Structures are given as C-alpha cells and as structure tokens.
Amino acid sequence: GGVEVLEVKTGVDAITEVECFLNPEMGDPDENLRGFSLKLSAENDFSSDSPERKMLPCYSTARIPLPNLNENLLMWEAVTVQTEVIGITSMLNLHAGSQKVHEHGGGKPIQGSNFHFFAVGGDPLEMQGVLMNYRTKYPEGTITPKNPTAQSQVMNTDHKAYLDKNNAYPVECWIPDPSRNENTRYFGTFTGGENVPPVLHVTNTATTVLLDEQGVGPLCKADSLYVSAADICGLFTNSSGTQQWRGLARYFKIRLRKRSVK
Amino acid sequence: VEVLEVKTGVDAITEVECFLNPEMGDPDENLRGFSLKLSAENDFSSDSPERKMLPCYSTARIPLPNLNENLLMWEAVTVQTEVIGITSMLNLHAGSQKVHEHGGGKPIQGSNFHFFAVGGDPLEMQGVLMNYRTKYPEGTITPKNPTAQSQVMNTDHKAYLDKNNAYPVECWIPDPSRNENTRYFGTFTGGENVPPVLHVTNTATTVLLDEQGVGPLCKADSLYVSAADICGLFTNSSGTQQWRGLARYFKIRLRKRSVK
C-alpha cells in the first residue's frame, strides 16, 4: 500500500527538474584504466571460483536530495525521465590497445555480452540475488548473497538487498526484484554471446513516462530521488588476447511535480 | 459456464504472485538449474536420453481465496512476468571454456525457449517428437505409443501439464486446438551461436481477457501457472555442454465474476 495519494499541486513552483551523470563501476584495475575491468580469468572450476574485486562490474547508484517542499503533506512525484549512455563513439578508437582483427588490419572492436539498465525511484532499488555458481567466493569489498546454497542458482528468497552502496553490488549476482519495487520503475536488457555487437541510440527527444496505471509516479520518501544504472558495453580484447569489460556513464534528466499525500 | 457480471467492492479484487523454479535436469546437488551434459550423434534407432539431460516444463497451482460456501469464480485479468537472474550469465570466470588463449570464458548461448501460461485449468499439451523411436527414460511422461506420424501431428498425444519436472520440453507444446481457459505465450530460437536476449521491467503487463472481455475463470479456486525458460548452452572447459535455465516470476491480478 504505502501512502494515500491525493491531488497534484499546480503552480509555476510545483515542478522541478534534476539531472546527473552516473559513472560506471567496471572494476578500475589501476588509476589509468578508469571505466575498464581487470582482465578476465577463465576455466576456474565451480569448486574453486574466487574472482578478484577489480574483475567484477558493479551496479551504479546515487541518491539525489530534492528541495524540502513541506517547509497536508507533499511529496515529489517523478513523472518523466530522459536517459542516455555517454561516450558511445569512443569505441571508434581502434588504433589503441586492441588486438588486430588480422594481419595489417585495424584493432578489434569492443563486442560481446552486454547489459544496459537504469532505474528511477523514491526508494533504493530492491534487488534479488541469483548466482551462476553458488560456491563462488566473492572478494572483500563486494556485497553478494549471504549463506548461498544450490537454490541460489535458481531462486533463493533470502537474497534480498537494497542497492544502497555504489561500486559494491556485482552485476553478475543481483537483478531487480519484480516482486517488490513498488516505488521504482526499472528497465534492463541483457544480450550475451562472444560476438554480440553493441547497439546504442542517442537522442534528446525521447522520454520515458514513470506514471503507473493510476497515473502515479515514484514518490520520493524523505525528499530523496534514487537513480541506478549498469551499462556494460562488451569486452575489450588486448593485443595479447586478454579481455576486459568496458563500461560507460549514463545521464538522467528527471521531471518531478508536487503531490499531496495522507 | 455462462459468464455474468463482474462483482465490485474492494474485496472483489485480489493479487497473487510466485517464483517458479526451472527444471533443467539437475545432474547433481550442486548443479541446480543445469542439465546433465549433452550426448550427441546417437542414431534415431537407438536414441535413449538420460532423465537428467532432459529439461521439463515447470508448473504450479496457486490457491485463491475461497468464494462459495449466486456462484462466483476468480477471473484472471492481467499478468506481469519476468525471467529471474539474467545477469548471472555475466560470470565468465567459472567453469566455461576460454574463447581463446588468454581470453575470458565463453558466454552461454545457443538454442533457447521461453514460455509461460496462466489459466484456470491445467495447461493442455500436444506431443510432437523429433524422432518417434526415442526411448524416453523412467520418470518422464512422453507420448504413448509413438508412430512415425508423431513426428508431425499425432492427435492421440494429448496431455495435461499435471506434474512438475516430468514433461520434457522437447516432447510437448501448448495445444492450440484446446486451452479455452488458458493464455499461453512462447518463443523458440534455435542455432549454435544464438545470443540470449532478455528484457526486464516492472512496467509491462499482459492482459488475459479474450475477445469478449473474459479472462481465465479459475475452477475450484485454483490458478495455474506454467513455464519453460531454457536460456542456452553452457560450454565447459572440456567442450561438454549443459542446458542452463532460470526461474520465472508471476504477478496475477484477479476479480470476482458471477457465473450460472
């Protein structure tokens, strides 16, 4: 249930707009390789899987404080969001670091499995843990399912969490929880495969509406707005054959209005 | 039954949910969600697959609030559904064969099947076989008395999805000539290198009403959900392959309907 929603406030001061860029968290193996992950290991048996922290991309998130409008109670209601991945043309650099596609050719473009996801809500994004291999020892500095069992590889209802920390929740361990998130709208698409091509579209004319069937958007509890993202673009193949995840930042522009509640 | 007016008044609507586990074969206690490794090149005359190698349809029966003690039935109106755990395929460091020397592990890919159903009766199925001479193992329910026409259309191969982890996906499909009280949706994509493509959002809803505006009517206050979500093949370092499946979520909205 939550709160009982009343009328929408009108007036020139009844609308506000917030924007932000959300950095990607791919692992950052050293101070020069911001936006990349550590090179990927392979063929570790399920019984001895223990990835390094700098190899694991994580969800990005930020809490945006909104103007205090109570100064009947009011809440900021998120109505629309414009969002976009920043820096897609940087993958047209094929002269740096990447393995040549063949003798005398250019570098190999970033390609492979990718995941593009964003969420807007008045609460932190609620997440459900699912694991490829429950026996994985995840490293210090990450937050992954507690007390994992073999059912963590399908559905273990004890693996609930709030996306409440940045660069902490590995993407491979968590997904948005459809059984919750009453105060959040989320959108994501996964495409896996060695040769999956990145496909990214930019325009400042597209808007996603955040209202539900009753015309209510996410209501910002404690005057805070939550943005979340994960934009793994694919793998970068170095000249030696090693591979690293590559991520890019995401822009948000959210329009909000004042809404009466009881 | 003869369908009358929709009842109104707060207590007239209800909303139920459940997570439905995949039944991929589960070769041992640690590999829940996977199948046994796949055999190959067995001649049609001696095709004899093991049970743990065969993915099966998932199904469950969700009890609804009792209505009768002026007959009423629960009518499913909408469903929100989603495959759970799609980002776990971003683990390329465990168990999977390297794409090349010094590279990362090979992603899960290949043939996949994604299917769900919501109804007031058990999903009704029709059997079709790749090879009618296949000897299906103990523990599975497959077409009885298969013949060569089982490979195209044998109308005797009718079944209800009335048991979990027992009807192999490769043997059965939703029966379009029946299922008057069920809505089903499925998409098959086949091939070695087929990339998995999975979308998640809590903003999409499927309406279950038919042309007359009637949704599935729940017999005996029992709502049926069914699913099959084979995501592709996992390639181990040695080259062996296993199916990988994922669970599916349901949130169904229902209302009280008068019937005569």
Epitope: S48, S50, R135, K137, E140, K146, T149 | E29
Partner: single-chain antibody, 225 residues
C-alpha cells in the same frame, strides 16, 4: 546477551537414539542459520549439520546423513538434533552455534555443549611464543585461497570463540592483534602483542560446499609464562 544451552546428552547403547535440544535467547532466532558441531574427547571440531532460517534447507555431513535429523521451532527459539542408529564414532560433545558474521557460514555464538557417550586442512599441532612477541598459526590445503576461511579460538574446557571470519574480517569485541590472511595454499592467523589469555587451541574452518565445512586439527599456542 546471546545465550545458547544444549541439553539431552547421556550414555547411549550403540544403535540407540537420542534427541538433543538447544535453547536460544538474546537475539532474533529466525534471522540466522543454526549449526551443530561436535568434538570427540581430545580431538578437534567437526561440522555435523546446519539449517536455514526457516528450516526449509538442511545439510548434513556424510557420516551422519540418513541417521541425524536437524530441526528448529522458531516460535519457541529452539534447535534440535535427532540422532538415530548411534555408532561409537559419534561420541563427542555437541555444540549449538549461530551463523551471524559474513557470507560463508562462520560460527559466531556457541553454547556450553552437551556430552554424548556411545559405547583435509593441515595445521601444526603446537606453537610456542614469548609474551609480547608475535605468533603465526597456519592452515594448509589445496587452493585454500580460493575458499573462505574462518579462525576460532578455544580455551581448555570452554566453548569456541570466533576470532576471524571470511579470511580477514574480525568480529566486534576481538582485538586487532588477531589478524588473518589467505593466499595460495596456506591461510595464516597472526596473533600480535601476545598475552597470557591468548594461549589456547586455535582452529581453522573452510567453506567449500553445502555439506563440506572442513575444520583443521588445531594448534595449541602456549605463552611462555
């Protein structure tokens, strides 16, 4: 605050049955896994069985699977272990332990134990250290760095205490003098500014799978007094 009381231990004829009880108080019982650990007289600790918060998942060590049945009553804050077909190899003090710190089944709070009489990881047996000096206790195994390690301290005639969980993390109330590291094929516990109280038996535990919670034999650390 937290209190655990085991009961039910007595003499049992081989092939007989016995039912152990553990009364829990001082914490939210239904929020944590519970574990049974046994220790034969003069030997080390052995993981026997554990159970999920709501009891929907149960796991057993091989030697007792089929004979023992673990259960819990969250309305009464009680944990139970039903032992059938008891063999002489089952003779041990049985501990009741909570699963609070970390992700990989470390054991935080232990009871006083109850005695039942029926009738992989390499540790050095002994280590000596001077007071104020620094002592190292090692735990060895194949690719132990790939698995999580927990370290426990047990003073003679007392219940075990968890000093390090998930390789390097120290619980609240444990001094920074105790330190843990795990790499390669050896995990090491380091005790610095050694004090008289530090003298005890020290155990390493590894989580490899749901039924595999191996303990080490243990090392006696003796402070020159």
């Amino acid at each position: 605050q937290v209190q655990l009381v085991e009961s039910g231990g007595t003499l049992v004829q081989p092939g007989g049955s016995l039912r152990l009880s553990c009364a829990a108080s001082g914490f939210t019982f239904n929020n944590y896994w519970m574990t049974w650990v046994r220790q034969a007289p003069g030997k080390g600790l052995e993981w026997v069985a554990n159970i999920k918060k709501d009891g929907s998942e149960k796991y057993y060590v091989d030697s007792v699977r089929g004979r023992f049945t673990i259960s819990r009553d969250n309305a009464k804050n009680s944990l139970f272990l039903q032992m059938n077909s008891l063999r002489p190899e089952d003779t041990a003090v049985y501990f009741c332990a909570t699963v609070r710190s970390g992700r990989y089944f470390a054991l935080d709070d232990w009871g006083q134990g109850t005695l039942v009489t029926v009738s992989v990881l390499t540790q050095p047996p002994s280590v000596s250290v001077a007071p104020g000096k620094t002592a190292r206790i090692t735990c060895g195994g194949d690719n132990i760095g790939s698995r999580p390690v927990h370290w426990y301290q047990q003073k003679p005639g007392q219940a075990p205490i968890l000093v390090v969980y998930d390789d390097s993390n120290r619980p609240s109330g444990i001094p920074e003098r105790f330190s843990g590291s795990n790499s390669g094929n050896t995990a090491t516990l380091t005790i610095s500014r050694v004090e008289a109280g530090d003298e005890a038996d020290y155990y390493c535990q590894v989580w490899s799978s749901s039924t595999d919670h191996p303990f080490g034999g243990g090392t006696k650390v003796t402070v020159l007094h």
